[PDB]
Swiss-Prot record:
Its EC number is 3.5.2.6. The lineage of its organism: Bacteria, Pseudomonadati, Pseudomonadota, Gammaproteobacteria, Enterobacterales. Changing V295E: Increases activity about 100-fold with respect to cefotaxime. Reduces activity about 5-fold with respect to cephalothin. Reduces thermodynamic stability. It comes from Escherichia coli (strain K12). PROSITE patterns: BETA_LACTAMASE_C. Inhibited by the beta-lactamase-blocking agents avibactam, enmetazobactam, relebactam, nacubactam, vaborbactam, taniborbactam, zidebactam, and beta-lactam-analog boronic acids, via a covalent binding to Ser-61. Inhibited by non-beta-lactam, benzo(b)thiophene-2-boronic acid (BZBTH2B) and various cyclic boronates. Not inhibited by clavulanic acid. Inhibited by O-aryloxycarbonyl hydroxamates, via cross-linking of the active site Ser-61 to Lys-312. Weakly inhibited by citric acid. Transmembrane segments: none annotated. The keyword Hydrolase applies. Keywords: Antibiotic resistance, Hydrolase, Periplasm, Signal. Belongs to the class-C beta-lactamase family. The class C beta-lactamase family has a specific amino-acid numbering system known as SANC, for structural alignment-based numbering of class C beta-lactamases, or else the simpler name structural position. A multiple sequence alignment was used to derive a consensus sequence and then the consensus was numbered taking into account insertions and deletions. This allows use of identical numbers, e.g. for active site residues, despite differences in protein length. This is Beta-lactamase. The active site is at S61 (acyl-ester intermediate). The gene is ampC. NCBIfam families: bla_class_C, BlaEC, CMY2-MIR-ACT-EC. Changing Y218G: Increases activity about 180-fold with respect to cefotaxime. Reduces activity about 100-fold with respect to cephalothin. Reduces thermodynamic stability.
Amino acid sequence: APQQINDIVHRTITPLIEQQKIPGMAVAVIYQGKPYYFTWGYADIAKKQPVTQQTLFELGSVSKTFTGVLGGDAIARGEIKLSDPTTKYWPELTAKQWNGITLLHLATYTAGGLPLQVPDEVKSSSDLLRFYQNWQPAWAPGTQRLYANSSIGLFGALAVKPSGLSFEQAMQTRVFQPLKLNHTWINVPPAEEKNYAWGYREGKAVHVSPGALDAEAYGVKSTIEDMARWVQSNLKPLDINEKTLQQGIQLAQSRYWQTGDMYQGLGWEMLDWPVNPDSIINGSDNKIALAARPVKAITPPTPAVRASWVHKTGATGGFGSYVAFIPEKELGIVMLANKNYPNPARVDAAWQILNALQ
Ligand SMILES: *[B]([O])([O])C1=[C]N(C2=[C][C]=[C]C(Cl)=[C]2)N=[C]1
Ligand SMILES: OB(O)c1cnn(-c2cccc(Cl)c2)c1
């Protein structure tokens, strides 16, 4: 644990915890490929349980990066094609607005205005079919980006259909297991509940509730160790022995669309490195991140660029996560907290850390 890393991590994170009133936090820095871990505070305030390297946190939409890689793996397996019509995997989706909407559009939030959330009222699967059949696009496919659970969540559910596996089984067998992510879960087993931190929202202990497409869009929980290993795998996909998974990772980092200075991957989002920090910091604010923006198609997509800042923010009601890494520098960071605090503070802290080490 080189002093440089200790100092820049503590110097940045300590004031962040104080300003944001974060109950508990874990951080991993991957430096020259090796991880270094840091923890603070409480996984469970009431029971006085500290955050440790084994504490599980809700990753919220960092889960989209696993969905994107799992889709990538299914493409590499020849099970699906991003050019396939959505209706190929969901024949019951007969309404005319779906003509021309492909798995690519679903995966990348470009279908034409699918909403951020699946409505709470959608409880059953027939409820889900009804919702997509009745949905009216505001825009032609592949013209505008609108960040959306109903978009990538459906991509993840359709991507695994040819396998015949449930989404959770596919994720476990094809992604978590090969990568030795043995403490990463879509559903936290009872044996691991001791380690599951509470999230804190207005002072109240909370965990994410069940919802439609939850597993696919925001439902993964993980430890700081497994998340460092996730970053290592995404930094260096060529060390992964399972061919389709290596390829899936690279596909998730390809650049499909551009809006402003960001590129949309599958789950991952990327900018050219060196980045302008105001651009990623201000860009992470939900006033920008969640807004409808015109996109330019990248035809064909650019393969994973090593000189990139590759990142994803994640939140649930009680948790705030961030992952960012730079392949060409063998450098990355994971920040997991059990309070959903503002995105720009996450990115500001991550850039201050990675910049000092780069
Ligand atoms: B993502 O973190 O940007 C994201 C997560 N969610 C979410 C979290 C909990 C419940 C529900 Cl319904 C949605 N939306 C966006
Ligand atoms: O030659 B290109 O740069 C190229 C070839 N294939 N792709 C690509 C990228 C991402 C996803 C898919 Cl299905 C194909 C880019």
